[PDB]
């Protein structure tokens, strides 16, 4: 997280990390047995870690639950980044407590300017690298689609939205992918991609969760 602040232990109870011995992507807990993330975070034998604030210490309230199914959206296109969403089923139900809570699916899509919360363990610098041990938070608004297509010509699909600050300095970054974008207590976005991190006229682009709500319900119901 570039230009953010320390969340706190209990503050992002829906944030999860995707692991296979190391952290590589963020995720969002949507119910007791299902986590959503980005399609390009797909990996064999994913282990899901819940309730972490410091990832490098076994703080005790953590739960490491292995994935039972890792289902990429069937329309995911490795060339166009469209349909960038993946479902991860946990092998056992996660126990909800002060550090572990589910985030609910959105009812409608948010409109430009809505204030949103982005979190992850990604880079904190726009040039170079520095990875924090504790979870970092950032407040950022959704931007209009007209300015979004101007920033990334020919690349913005109907299932994406831009978010952040046209000035730069505040943005998501490498290592946050799959993590939550929460507006009004609703999971509205998934951190996906961007040109560098926090560069001028290069905002973050995030998968538009609201387009997949029926598919999420159908997939959870079917499996």
């Amino acid at each position: 997280i570039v230009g953010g602040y320390t969340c706190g232990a209990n503050t992002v109870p829906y944030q999860v990390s995707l692991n296979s011995g190391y952290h590589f992507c963020g995720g969002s807990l949507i119910n007791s047995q299902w986590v959503v993330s980005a399609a390009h975070c797909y990996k064999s034998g994913i282990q899901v870690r819940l309730g972490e604030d410091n990832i490098n210490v076994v703080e005790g309230n953590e739960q490491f639950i292995s994935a039972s199914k890792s289902i990429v959206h069937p329309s995911y296109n490795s060339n166009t980044l469209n349909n960038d969403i993946m479902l991860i089923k946990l092998k056992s139900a996660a126990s909800l407590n002060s550090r572990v809570a589910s985030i609910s699916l959105p009812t409608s899509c948010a409109s430009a300017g809505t204030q949103c919360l982005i979190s992850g363990w990604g880079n904190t610098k726009s040039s170079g690298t520095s990875y924090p041990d504790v979870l970092k938070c950032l407040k950022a608004p959704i931007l209009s689609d007209s300015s979004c297509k101007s920033a990334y010509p020919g690349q913005i699909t109907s299932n994406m939205f831009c978010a952040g600050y046209l000035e730069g300095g505040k943005d998501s970054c490498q290592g946050d992918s799959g993590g939550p974008v929460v507006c009004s207590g609703k999971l509205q976005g998934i951190v996906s991609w961007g040109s560098g991190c926090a560069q001028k006229n290069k905002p973050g682009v995030y998968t538009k969760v609201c387009n997949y709500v029926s598919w999420i319900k159908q997939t959870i119901a079917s499996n």
Binding site: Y42, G122, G128, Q174, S192, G194
Partner: protein, 163 residues
Amino acid sequence: SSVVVDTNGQPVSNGADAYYLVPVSHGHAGLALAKIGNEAEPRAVVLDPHHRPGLPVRFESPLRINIIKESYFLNIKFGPSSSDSGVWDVIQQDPIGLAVKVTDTKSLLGPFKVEKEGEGYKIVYYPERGQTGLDIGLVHRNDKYYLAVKDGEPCVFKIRKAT
């Protein structure tokens, strides 16, 4: 879908770290720069015996994930992370052909993928993203090995972390 890794078993970072490309068939060859024709500055990438360890590269994908997959379209660059200099590209140029060269611009999605080949990895060039790929091999000239398109005859690498 498979993760690209270094010689120590660690996944290749996304732009964060540089890596030496150590060929298995040219143990004493590192990445280096050379002129092709009438160029003043060296812009062509070669394997030069007079350069060990060679020049390290960075792998960049606009995806905000910390690792590199086979299916990601990648930019490959020399020098610092956020810089725009030393970015690889393919340019028609005699007498070598489809030669690997450097420019000072960075496209959003690069034309390179890193794919498993033999006991190591090959750099594969796709003129555009949806297309069929072309392996980068070696063109023998001037006591050095110019990296260039040679489909069917890939140049095999190991990926050594810069430390």
